[PDB]
Design a protein around this ligand. Structure first.
Ligand code: CPS
Ligand code: CA
Ligand code: CA
Ligand code: CA
Ligand code: CA
Lengths: 85, 84
């Protein structure tokens, strides 16, 4: 709504962007390695410019974020990336 | 720099957190007072009904304070997005 603060609008956008990529393949609510690499390469071109230059590094970031090591990133796991920057 | 919409969002969540966390005590964390102010001013819609009861807002924080030190680190705070 118009009443939505900037924090609220930005939270909604992060949620939508996560699901925009997580719905693509496999389970709709999580990012497998390919979905994560695509989000990182297309939408974190700047915040992860260095890392993006070594696929193995991105894979390593995913393993760090994948708390329960089920090879999938849930929303709660993925957002921790924000705190790692 | 052509920051993506995602990077802008993240910048905004980091700036807002820090806008409130620098106000009292430790600059890097939100205490109960800073958290209440952040919710009162910037989560008026997402937490409209809860904002009517500051005891509810205090419970929300206890819930987010994983290591129970009465301070919310950025990592603890952002989990709120998951509770929506
Ligand atoms: C209803 C809202 C989320 C609303 C939301 O999604 N706003 C966007 C609009 C859609 C959610 C976000 C955090 C939740 C609270 C905390 O967990 C603490 C505590 C845990 C207990 O077990 C039950 C009571 C209480 C106060 C919980 C209540 C309620 O559940 C809350 C306020
Ligand atoms: Ca998926
Ligand atoms: Ca996982
Ligand atoms: Ca503080
Ligand atoms: Ca804490």
């Amino acid at each position: 709504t118009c009443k939505m603060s900037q924090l609220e609008r930005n939270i909604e956008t992060i949620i939508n962007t996560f699901h925009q990529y997580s719905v693509k393949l496999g389970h709709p609510d999580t990012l497998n390695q390919g979905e994560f690499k695509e989000l990182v390469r297309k939408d974190l071109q700047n915040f992860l410019k260095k890392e993006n230059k070594n696929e193995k590094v991105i894979e390593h970031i995913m393993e760090d974020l994948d708390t329960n090591a089920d090879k999938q990133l849930s929303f709660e796991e993925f957002i921790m990336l924000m705190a790692r920057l």
